[PDB]
Amino acid sequence: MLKIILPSLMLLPLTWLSSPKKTWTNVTSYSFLISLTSLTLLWQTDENYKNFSNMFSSDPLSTPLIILTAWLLPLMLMASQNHLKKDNNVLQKLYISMLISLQILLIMTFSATELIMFYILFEATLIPTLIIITRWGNQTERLNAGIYFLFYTLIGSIPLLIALILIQNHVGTLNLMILSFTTHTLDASWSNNLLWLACMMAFLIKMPLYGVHLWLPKAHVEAPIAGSMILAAILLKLGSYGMIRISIILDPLTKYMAYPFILLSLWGMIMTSSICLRQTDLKSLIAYSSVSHMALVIASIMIQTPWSFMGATMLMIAHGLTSSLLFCLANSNYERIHSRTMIMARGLQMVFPLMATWWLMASLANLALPPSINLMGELFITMSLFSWSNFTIILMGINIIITGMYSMYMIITTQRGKLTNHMINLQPSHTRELTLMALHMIPLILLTTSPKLITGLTM
Amino acid sequence: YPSKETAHWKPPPWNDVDILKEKAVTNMTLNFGPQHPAAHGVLRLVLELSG
Amino acid sequence: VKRFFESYHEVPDGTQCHRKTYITTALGGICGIIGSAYSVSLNPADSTLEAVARVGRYTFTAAAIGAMFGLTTCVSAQVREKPDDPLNYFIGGCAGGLTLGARTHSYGTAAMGCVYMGTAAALFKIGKLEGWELFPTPKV
Amino acid sequence: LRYGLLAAILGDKTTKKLHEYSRVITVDGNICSGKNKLAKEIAQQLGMKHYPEAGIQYSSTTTGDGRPLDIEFSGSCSLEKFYDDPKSNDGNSYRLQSWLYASRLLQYADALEHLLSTGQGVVLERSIYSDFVFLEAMYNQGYIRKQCVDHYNEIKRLTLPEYLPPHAVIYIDVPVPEVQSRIQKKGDPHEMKVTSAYLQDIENAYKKTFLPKMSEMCEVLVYDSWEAEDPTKVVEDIEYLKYNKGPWLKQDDWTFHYLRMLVQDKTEVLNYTTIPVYLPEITIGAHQGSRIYNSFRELPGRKYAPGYNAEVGDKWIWLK
Amino acid sequence: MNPITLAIIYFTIFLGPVITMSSTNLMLMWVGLEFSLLAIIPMLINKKNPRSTEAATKYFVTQATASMIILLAIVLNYKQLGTWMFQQQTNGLILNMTLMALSMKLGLAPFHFWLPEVTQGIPLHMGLILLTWQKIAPLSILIQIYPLLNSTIILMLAITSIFMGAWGGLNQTQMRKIMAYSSIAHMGWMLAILPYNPSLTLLNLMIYIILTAPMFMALMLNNSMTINSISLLWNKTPAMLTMISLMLLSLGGLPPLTGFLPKWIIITELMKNNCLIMATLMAMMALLNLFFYTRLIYSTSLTMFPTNNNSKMMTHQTKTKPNLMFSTLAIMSTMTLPLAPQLI
Amino acid sequence: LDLIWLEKTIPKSTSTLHTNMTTLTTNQKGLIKLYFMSFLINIILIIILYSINL
Amino acid sequence: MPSTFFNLTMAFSLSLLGTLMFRSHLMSTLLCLEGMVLSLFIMTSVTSLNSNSMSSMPIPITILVFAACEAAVGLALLVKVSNTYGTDYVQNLNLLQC
Ligand SMILES: CCCCCCCCCCCCO[C@@H]1O[C@H](CO)[C@@H](O[C@H]2O[C@H](CO)[C@@H](O)[C@H](O)[C@H]2O)[C@H](O)[C@H]1O
């Protein structure tokens, strides 16, 4: 794994030593090459997960997330090349450094073997994210958004640290493989219930859960494009990954401790898909769609079945690509008209015919058009929940209808109708922007072609 | 965070020196004489002394 | 002595209401006394009569909160047979918080006190059941 | 070996260097009074160092290349704009006055450092003690606001009490009609716009607040114009002035040491002129401030520390 | 001050804690405490303004009363055991009195009120000395008697200190007061683990000092004694913003930075000793500190407050103040988590 | 629910609680008289604690 | 011995109470500190004499030496307070509330 980690570190001296003209070219090219290198994790020809040392590992669940993290960084650098067009060279290099440091920390987090190291890195990722949001946002509410994002995570994370310390005291180790192989049942005492809550709360907040999601729309609305990209793509999946990892030692309490959160997620998916129907900010609409989609991942991981885990992983990857694509599409119009209101710009397909094609593809992936991996994950989560209880199909169907409605409403409002002719500043779409959308879409098509890569541990 | 009680406060001076009210100096007043051995018996020297 | 307080855990919860209510009222009154002492010390009253009035207010409010907590916990654990269930303490803590809010004439304080005090009382009951110790001695 | 406690212990004591003409002499007077000529002659005859009146560009001339800088770097103020539109709306009046007070404070620090380090006296034209006359004239004429006056008074209260006053003050008294006639004769297209009320306010301040105050602690010498001419007479008065007054008598080596330490760090000298009092006339704003700061740091001989700019010929950087 | 006085007072300041740390006799430990108390007052009242005199008087009265209580404990132990040292058979009330008096000297809540005021009233370098060097002597005595201290008393003091520091730091716009409340919080953490593992108390002391000294040095760089004053750093000295941000976040205790290790290891040891409730409460309330540090970071490094016209003259000048120690201590305080096992 | 009650119940309520505690705790008059009265109360409390704990 | 030591302990406690509860004069608090020192000195002297521990007789004198140094420093601070405000009332010493 060090063969992936170390070049990522060397990107930083490259950024700070490259000439001001060539810095973006060099950093983007070498980030692409590191993303290519990260594909060596897909060479698994047996059921024996990869264990490189005492400190790093890779499984079918970790490898897709690691590869997605490696792949995103070039895309974030490309997306950040325009709104950082006026900043000083030192400031541009600082932004590049923040993004690279986020990539390094996320890869280390997803390759971590110990829960305590996982915790240290999963909480270290906050500093670059707070810096990116607050130092490069455009509105006065970015400070409060950053405060929310930081403390929603910290409050839930402290109990996680306490629980990890308790587990290490009781067992003697936090190594995930040792915990999995020597796992034993938990007595249904009140103390063990509180341990379950302390183990799951940090990840549920990060997911986020329905009741504690207010930090996510704020962060997306106030964050720069790279901030929104990385956030939606990976920082939400940190919670799902942690839940999948740590639930192996919390059995059998899950069977009865999952009801409150299964219900919260199942209802909140509907309650946020509905908000998407009448959200005025496009970024807020995308954020609430993400909340509703992550409700499915929460529910599937809670019910814990071979189908639920695979569907959750596939949906994690598919959402990571699709939400980032939607955020980039929205930012393309934002960089031109300087407003996030959806009604402000209309009929944009009359002036950006190909950007409209990217819009349509992103929206179709969002509403889950077969055979897209979006629909693979959603369908298998639906089947697992149906096996759980046959009345979950009612909520799933309501959410499906609402998802179709708001997804197509976005397109009809923005790309269709009569052009808002008064906008003289609608410049032709940049080659950079079109390449960004293409790089978001092509991996989705290839993974639809070969979905075996993005199944999880179970299948 | 202002409070009803803290309302009457003010920020401290930029350099710790405060503009403090002038201090009255009340030098002691003594009627040296007339009935004094060294006043020559008919001199009322009113002395303002500091110590 | 102080064993009067440790007498709270003699008969199983849900029995000896009057006695448990007396104990909890004493605890609340003691806490209110200490709080009034600190408030009068730092933040002095304008007059001695005003200071004594504030001491009385704090002590009576705290005693009422404690009495309500104890009475509601016992009454719950008696009306429903559950003699050792943290929900009784949660209900008692919410009743104490509502008492605080009513005495202060504040709905927001009522609700926040209910939630916080209920959680604290439930955790205290869970600690007594599961054997946690506040202030453990060094065992290493 | 920069000056410090170690240097003071090993030597470099001020009282040792002080001599008969190790004084501070401050020439004062209304606009166009002969201050420049009088100060130049006094300095040349007494061996002291002449310090031309601090202006908008004193700091730029004293630091870096020595060349004047763009006004955006040197204060965003203009004396010509002050005279053209004294009652502006961008606060050029008070911005100019505060900048000039800061420049005068910096120059006074330089003069005190020179005197204490070498023992050679300094002849200054006006100073931080007499700067307030212009502000009072501005306020009386309505060019600034009471808040600006309060801010100026606060900065003066924070900064002035830390330095010793001048040994001798020399006030050239010339009446307002002659000030006006001299201004017209000089013929400055902008200076000529000064009203006579403004000059009368300056004279009123000089004669009401300044001279009585400075008489408490310094040696004051008031001259008419016909005596200010022929500077040899003024020098002959100074040469026999007896200084038995003021705070200069109670000083000793271990008071001059700390005064020198204060006056030697120009950053500490100007620390309090930049207090965060959000007066609109002086507040810049983040965008313009960052733009100007970056443009300044991009100037030749200003990107790095003085000894570390290879563009301006600095050498041996890798071993410094 | 002239050189003779400077030498003779700095030597006394240095000698006090050295005598306390090296003494075997409780009376000579008290003598070291008295040396510190007497020698520091002139440096507190050096500048001679009403606030300086008030701070000096408050410090003197509080610390003299605390020293008298400590001497009472010492004398009663001498009466009881015929020895000048606390033994296993020393009386519980004697040890409790000693603990309370030493906590008053340190500034642990509720004996904390004097500390923020005295810190506010004195120059920044004196505040650095007071909050760093003066804490060693009182803590050494406690570390010598750690098998004898009362866990209940110490944990009440510790949690009270954490809560009061966290809540005090929120309401302060004054940098010296914020430093004082940070001191109170970190001293609460230090005292929480004294009965269990004084090595971790020493570790927390060392990390706290290595974080606090650079913060005070950075404050002294421009005499930034207020949030608005420090906000002008982006104009007056931009290069220090990154290190100030990292030092503040480390003081708060964010994982990747070195300041995390004290809290993490202390929670580990408390849990090992089965101190779950107190450990959880402390770690939970140590987030208000992160909040009021992040507010400072917003005001100083992640935004740009309005600046003054006169600051251009500031920009013109050349500066030489930051020592070689600032960089060393800041790097050591922020980037040392990987070397965690060596520190413990 | 999303813009009103879920704001009031969790983030706004927590922020209000701690902003109330900070103002309650940091309104000190700055008088050594009151500070030492508080210290006396603390000493009495500790003595009582020890006495009743034996 | 026992009754004497109990009385000395109670006298020290009274002096400590007089120190803790102020009464508008800094000099009176300084005097209460002196009273505490005196009580402690008597206790140590009585204990040493009763034990015949002659080697511990230096300690009472050192107590007085350091108490006298502390009293001198306190009196100097009183001089400074009187210079600043005109009296030694502790009510004035409240500038650091803000
Ligand atoms: C389930 C456990 C996990 C959930 C934990 C929730 C903890 C979150 C705490 C985050 C604190 C947010 O703190 C936030 O501070 C900002 C300052 O920017 C306040 O900001 C707001 O304050 C008030 C409204 O109340 C307005 O007057 C002000 O203009 C506005 O900015 C918010 O009212 C407060 O909510």
Ligand SMILES: CCCCCCCCCCCCO[C@@H]1O[C@H](CO)[C@@H](O[C@H]2O[C@H](CO)[C@@H](O)[C@H](O)[C@H]2O)[C@H](O)[C@H]1O
């Ligand atoms: C469960 C334990 C967790 C504890 C820690 C969780 C973090 C909580 C942070 C508490 C502090 C939040 O601090 C928050 O600051 C903002 C401004 O910044 C205040 O915001 C304030 O705005 C203005 C004044 O500026 C007032 O009119 C308003 O009423 C007030 O809300 C909030 O009232 C305060 O709550």
